[PDB]
Design a protein around this nucleic acid. Structure first.
Ligand SMILES: CC[C@H]1OC(=O)[C@H](C)[C@@H](O[C@H]2C[C@@](C)(OC)[C@@H](O)[C@H](C)O2)[C@H](C)[C@@H](O[C@@H]2O[C@H](C)C[C@H](N(C)C)[C@H]2O)[C@](C)(O)C[C@@H](C)C(=O)[C@H](C)[C@@H](O)[C@]1(C)O
Ligand SMILES: [Mg+2]
Ligand SMILES: [Mg+2]
Ligand SMILES: [Mg+2]
Ligand SMILES: [Mg+2]
Ligand SMILES: [Mg+2]
Ligand SMILES: [Mg+2]
Ligand SMILES: [Mg+2]
Ligand SMILES: [Mg+2]
Ligand SMILES: [Mg+2]
Ligand SMILES: [Mg+2]
Ligand SMILES: [Mg+2]
Ligand SMILES: [Mg+2]
Ligand SMILES: [Mg+2]
Ligand SMILES: [Mg+2]
Ligand SMILES: [Mg+2]
Ligand SMILES: [Mg+2]
Ligand SMILES: [Mg+2]
Ligand SMILES: [Mg+2]
Ligand SMILES: [Mg+2]
Ligand SMILES: [Mg+2]
Ligand SMILES: [Mg+2]
Ligand SMILES: [Mg+2]
Ligand SMILES: [Mg+2]
Lengths: 108, 134, 113, 56, 205
RNA sequence: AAGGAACUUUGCAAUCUCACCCCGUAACUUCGGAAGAAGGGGUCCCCACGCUUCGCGUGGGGCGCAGUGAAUAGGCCCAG
RNA sequence: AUUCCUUGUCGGGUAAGUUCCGACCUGCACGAAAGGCGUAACGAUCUGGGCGCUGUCUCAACGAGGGACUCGGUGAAAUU
RNA sequence: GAUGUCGGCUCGUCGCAUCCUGGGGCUGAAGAAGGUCCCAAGGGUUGGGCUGUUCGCCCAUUAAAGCGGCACGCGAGCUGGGUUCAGAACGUCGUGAGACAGUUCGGUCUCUAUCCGCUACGGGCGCAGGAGAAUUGAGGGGAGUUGCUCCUAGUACGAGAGGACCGGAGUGAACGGACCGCUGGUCUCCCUGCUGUCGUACCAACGGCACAUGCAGGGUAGCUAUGUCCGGAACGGAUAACCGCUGAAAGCAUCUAAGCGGGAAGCCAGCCCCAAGAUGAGUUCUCCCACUGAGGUAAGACUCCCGGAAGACCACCGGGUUAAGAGGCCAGGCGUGCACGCAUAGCAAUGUGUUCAGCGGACUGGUGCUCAUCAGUCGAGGUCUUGACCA
């Protein structure tokens, strides 16, 4: 409703990148998420999440991904922003053969 | 997000299997005891929130039997829980720790992962009984 | 505040079988006249279909074979019509409004190839 | 239920009908067959819209 | 006092320190000063700035005259700010600083003619038991014989949204001048491409 | 979504349930019934062997989130 | 299905139960074919509880279709 | 010749004899917590079990779970549980028909708003020329709630146990506004998977029907809470009860009799939004000019066409070839998740390669391929009187 000639694609993308981060390529399969954590006070305790990746959602700074683990008898899911300063790298446990980009059936 | 009428699990050995909610409250732990919750509404119980609840099904032989009305702290919400880096956690089943009025748990240990937000909320011994703080 | 790309008039299945039939006919005759809006609907649906057709592979032809059910019609679009537009940046269909109608008072128009 | 209370007078009623006044087509003479046609459409007489279109 | 015009471009995910902050991207493009309102030949203290550039052909003879007076340029938009006494012309360079709270005003996305459900909240009634009134369908509009009437200023269906709306105390996160870009914590009102005005905090601590 | 009767005069309404095969099935009882009690499991495609007919069982293998793959299709129980 | 006093008194279930089940007896005004007390089965009967499951609900949202709106054609009504 | 009646649900609004919150006086007020009275109606006043119930009892809360009015507010707004129709039963009274201070199961809630009133939104005219745009606010509405914790401070007080005022920090609840980046919902044909049957001759590949999507699995834009962001205030002025300065009538005393100063969630102003039909119609900037004998026209609109995060229609915004408005096309995004064909592997079902493939609604730019062609309709010459200033 203001008429300026401008591309919102490049405008927006302008700061996406500085906040965007590239991860090892995984469509399927298990992954170790090594996550740096200061919520313990001064202490920073690296934590492990080793899950199946069930979701690929987003792109740009918003691109995120989802893993699912069972820790101590009960199921857990977690969603990591590909650039989350609270995150150090992710690596592949193994490569999965999967038929759809979703994998929600894993909950049943 | 728990409401009255909403059955949660028990993360302790307190002797109670399933409890049903009765009242969400505003849960003041600090100073000397727990404090008295600001507001008589507060419609939903999140993680690190205290509820009051009826004990619905409990095992034989416990510090807590069926029908015991008791306060509990909320350990695992299915309803998603967002952190300030932006990640989110959510567990498959709902669950909780039965406590006393000074906040300490009534069970001798705690079962399965608990939300890190519980340590945000200063529930120490519960975080200490925790197999994993996620 | 209803906001979307699509227009319908009848139901969900109808708007298909109709847009398919009208595409089929305009490609068959080369010009048809219909109510103005129905023509406005027809324009970009058939246009994209001209572009599936050019490129010329069996794949393309079997894509066309879904919307266009007359083998003669598809052979025409594929072999005759498609190639004919070549240096055409895309988009030959144009719309001409003829004028209002007697019975329902609806303004009508020709869409032509 | 809900019916009207009295008849409405001729005055108020036509006052209502104040707005139904018809807008007559704003026409223009066709540059080709010299008969009056309608803007952004074809002249029904020749068939000409920029050169020639329909056969009449 | 201070302020500028800009267009809403989008909302995005961003980190300053380790916290993840939703921002909204505005562009406050340079804003020419077309007229200064003064107590003398005007009578109240204001200033007038333009925003969206105009094709010179499309401009009115009169408005071309207006822009001529101050000799700026064509602009699709003119706006007055108050107690503002700038010099030269107006960009956010030196205007806003990172971390200032601002009053960021826009025009709401119009929602059509809505229920009281959307509009006024309300309640409506059981989809369950015997009801022929579901959804919006308010109950009474009033009492019975005293005043048999309905209150002036009652709440019922209507054109909802399209409201002029200022949002108070939004935090300015980042500033790139010369890209004429500005980032703001939280939501600004109205859709994208929308015209917004960023200005000084009205009242805050 | 999270919750699951907190709705309400009342679960009113609407789900859930659903076919056929196998297994399995309580108090009480006029020994007929209760009973489809309750529950549990199978279900598609290919190949070899066998069989009392359409087919069926056995073994092995393949695919999907799912195989009465869409339509027809019981929610149940305890007390009065 | 008779109970006035009445939410009778104990108990059962419920976190809490004017209803419901059980027990008492003071039966306002049960009672033996205008049948009394029982009974398996049956019941689109009525009453209370549980499981299951759900937009009944917290608290609503999005989607579809048919009206509602707009143009051309036909064009009523109760009321006054 | 009809004013529908209990209770609920929905929507409110009002009184103050105030349940909370705010300000005070007294106290059998050390502090803490109170009891009472005075001022105060801005806002707030929770969820459940039983009952048709309001009431009431209980569970778990809370700052508090206020009392009444509005035809015991509200059925042309909903319910229809309660009572006052017809059936049936019990107790009971009547010889009977029947009956009731009873109880029990059952039992039709009526189509299309004329006016006023109300929420939205246009049309006309007015506002001493015709116009484009920017505005002052007269006035008017919204809002207004509160706990908790920390510091103050283990201070004042207090034998102790305990434990502050005041001021200053945080942190929520519920409520409201906006918003869709995140988390998720849903996205009726955007991608895929599946069954029966029918069809395009057959195979292979596809299309219909199985909803008004045949079923399932995802799911972009849009829309959307449960999701996110912001809010309630600070300040100032004038007050309430109240507390005081100066001070007489009344050599003393006296807040009052002259006068003067403090004093509340209340009043005004401050915050957000509306607003000159504020017929007392306001102000500022620019444009066309001083035709013609009611008509041509200037400046400028409108009609029309193409579209929109604008919308029932109107209105509003943008484009309309000195053109990037929309479609298509190209590139990318994004969704889906590996096409057809072919080759190969197996007796086959299937598997593998080619193939991060194929496909494609709404996204982000680009491109003159398509339609915005052509034209028509309308739109000023400025009333008068006085006063000032110049020729
Ligand atoms: C379907 C459409 C029919 O309406 C109904 O069925 C509703 C549902 C009745 O109420 C039904 C149902 C109910 C509950 O009333 C709503 C009940 O109380 C009455 C006795 O019968 C109505 C309204 C009755 O009115 C009411 O009659 C009462 C005696 C007095 C009352 N008055 C105070 C205003 C008045 O409104 C009454 C007598 O039937 C109206 C007369 C004119 C009729 O004969 C007309 C032709 C109706 O049959 C009808 C319009 O065709
Ligand atoms: Mg998602
Ligand atoms: Mg929209
Ligand atoms: Mg639309
Ligand atoms: Mg169909
Ligand atoms: Mg509702
Ligand atoms: Mg009424
Ligand atoms: Mg009156
Ligand atoms: Mg008003
Ligand atoms: Mg769920
Ligand atoms: Mg209930
Ligand atoms: Mg209730
Ligand atoms: Mg039912
Ligand atoms: Mg009892
Ligand atoms: Mg029978
Ligand atoms: Mg009443
Ligand atoms: Mg009317
Ligand atoms: Mg909210
Ligand atoms: Mg988005
Ligand atoms: Mg075939
Ligand atoms: Mg059909
Ligand atoms: Mg689907
Ligand atoms: Mg082979
Ligand atoms: Mg297609």
């Amino acid at each position: 409703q203001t008429h300026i000639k401008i591309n919102r694609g490049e405008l927006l993308r302008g700061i996406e990148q500085d906040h965007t981060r590239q991860l090892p390529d995984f469509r399927p399969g298990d992954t170790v998420r090594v996550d740096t954590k200061v919520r313990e006070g001064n202490r920073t305790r690296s934590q492990a999440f080793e899950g199946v990746v069930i979701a690929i959602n987003g792109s740009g700074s918003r691109k995120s991904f989802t893993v699912r683990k069972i820790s101590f008898g009960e199921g857990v899911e977690r969603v990591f922003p590909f650039a989350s300063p609270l995150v150090n790298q992710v690596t592949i446990v193994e490569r999965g053969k999967v038929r759809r980009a979703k994998l929600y059936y894993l909950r049943e | 997000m728990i409401m009255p009428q909403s059955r949660l699990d028990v993360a302790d050995n307190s002797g109670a299997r399933e409890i049903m909610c009765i009242r969400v409250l505003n849960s003041g732990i600090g100073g000397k005891g727990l404090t008295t919750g600001g507001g008589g509404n507060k419609r939903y119980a999140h993680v690190g929130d205290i509820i009051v609840a009826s004990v619905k099904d409990a095992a034989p032989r416990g510090a807590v039997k069926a029908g015991d009305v008791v306060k509990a702290v909320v350990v695992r919400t299915s309803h998603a829980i967002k952190r300030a880096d932006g990640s989110t956690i959510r567990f498959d089943r709902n669950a909780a720790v039965i406590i006393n009025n000074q906040g300490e748990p009534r069970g001798t240990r705690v079962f399965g992962p608990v939300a890190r937000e519980l340590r945000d909320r200063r529930f120490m011994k519960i975080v200490s009984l925790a197999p994993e703080v996620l | 505040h209803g906001k979307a790309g699509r227009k319908l008039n009848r139901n969900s299945s109808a708007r298909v079988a109709l847009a398919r039939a009208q595409a089929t006919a305009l490609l068959r005759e080369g010009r048809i006249q219909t109510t103005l809006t129905k023509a406005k609907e027809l324009r970009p649906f058939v246009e994209q279909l001209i572009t599936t057709a050019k490129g010329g592979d069996l794949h393309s032809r079997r894509l066309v074979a879904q919307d266009i059910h007359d083998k003669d019609v598809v052979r025409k679009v594929m072999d005759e019509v498609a190639p004919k537009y070549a240096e055409r940046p895309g988009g030959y269909t144009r719309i001409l409004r003829v004028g209002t109608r007697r019975g329902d008072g609806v303004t009508m128009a020709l869409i032509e190839l | 239920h809900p019916v009207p209370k009295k008849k409405t007078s001729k005055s108020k009623r036509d006052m209502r009908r104040s707005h139904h006044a018809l807008t007559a087509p704003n026409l223009t003479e066709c540059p080709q067959c010299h008969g009056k046609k309608l803007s952004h459409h074809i002249c029904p007489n020749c068939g000409y819209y920029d050169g020639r279109q329909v056969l009449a | 006092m201070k302020g500028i015009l800009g267009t809403k471009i989008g909302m995005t995910q961003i980190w300053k320190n380790d916290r993840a902050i939703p921002v909204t991207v505005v562009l406050a493009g340079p804003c020419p000063i077309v007229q200064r309102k003064t107590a003398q030949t005007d009578g109240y203290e204001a200033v007038q700035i333009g925003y969206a550039p105009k094709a010179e052909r499309k401009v009115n003879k009169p408005m071309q005259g207006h822009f001529a007076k101050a000799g700026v340029a064509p602009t699709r938009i003119l706006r007055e700010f108050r107690g503002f006494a700038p010099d030269g012309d107006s960009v956010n360079v030196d205007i806003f600083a990172e971390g200032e709270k601002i009053d960021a005003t826009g025009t709401s996305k119009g929602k059509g003619t809505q229920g009281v459900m959307k509009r006024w909240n309300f309640a409506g009634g059981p989809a369950s038991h015997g009801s022929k009134k579901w959804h919006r369908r308010p109950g009474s509009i009033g009492q019975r014989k005293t005043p048999g009437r309905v209150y002036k200023g009652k709440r019922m269906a209507g054109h909802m949204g399209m409201e002029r709306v200022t949002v108070q105390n939004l935090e300015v996160v980042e500033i790139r001048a010369g890209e004429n870009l500005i980032l703001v914590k939280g939501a600004i009102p109205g859709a994208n491409g929308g015209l917004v005005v960023l200005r000084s905090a009205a009242k805050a601590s």
